[PDB]
């Protein structure tokens, strides 16, 4: 009943930016200071994975 549109999920961009900038510094403790790390989307396989 009514209009239709896809389900979605919102995340505040500032909070996510801060969370990533805080996690990268803890990762640098294991994989080197003054280095670059990346993360793209999933590789492929199961829909639940």
């Amino acid at each position: 009943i009514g209009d239709i549109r896809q389900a979605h999920c919102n995340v505040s961009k500032a909070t996510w930016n801060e969370t990533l900038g805080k996690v990268v510094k803890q990762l640098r403790k294991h994989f080197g200071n003054n280095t670059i790390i990346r993360f793209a989307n999933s590789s492929g396989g199961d829909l639940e994975v």
Partner: antibody
Amino acid sequence: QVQLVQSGAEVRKPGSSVTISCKPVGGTFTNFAIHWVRQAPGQGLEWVGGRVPVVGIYKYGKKFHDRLRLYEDDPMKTVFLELRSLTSDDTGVYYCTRWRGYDTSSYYNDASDVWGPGTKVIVSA
Amino acid sequence: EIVLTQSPVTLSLSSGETGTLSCRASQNISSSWIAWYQQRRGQVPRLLISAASARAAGIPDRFTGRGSGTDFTLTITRLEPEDFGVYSCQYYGGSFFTFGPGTQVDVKR
């Protein structure tokens, strides 16, 4: 680009009621409000009422209390105006009006660039 | 209530002549709730200018809109025989919409 399609002309006896349909084509339904602007033969434009389809934010004209009723039908995606206690004054041409422009809010305070072809209501016994 | 009035009831203009229609509001209204419509020969009204200044889609350069607070003006620098008829101003701000009484333009003779 949106569009509005109305019904055909009708002749009703004085004192009875009349029902006019208005269906949009190619656009959002529950967002912007549907207004009704009538024109008596030879006079200026007159605002009948306004109503958001499904939300229910509606309001009629001061002249059209106890005689006007605006409703809708979403299975058909069509709004409906009902006018009771018809006199020779209510004879004229009625226009279904609407504005076009993740937004789930509802607008009622907006102009009308999309106009229906019109419906000719003739009150004559 | 909020009611509108239009001053130059019948405004005569020839080809290339410049005219200015007026639309006075009763109370003080915002400059973002006034629109101008064109109605030629009892046909469908066409939105000329929204928000008293925002020229609509495809509306030519000849139609310029101004106004603030109480008075709103519609200036036509030049005109073809295409744009003749009744011009109406609409207040679309509050919960009650109201139109202008209409203003017809003539070929000046």
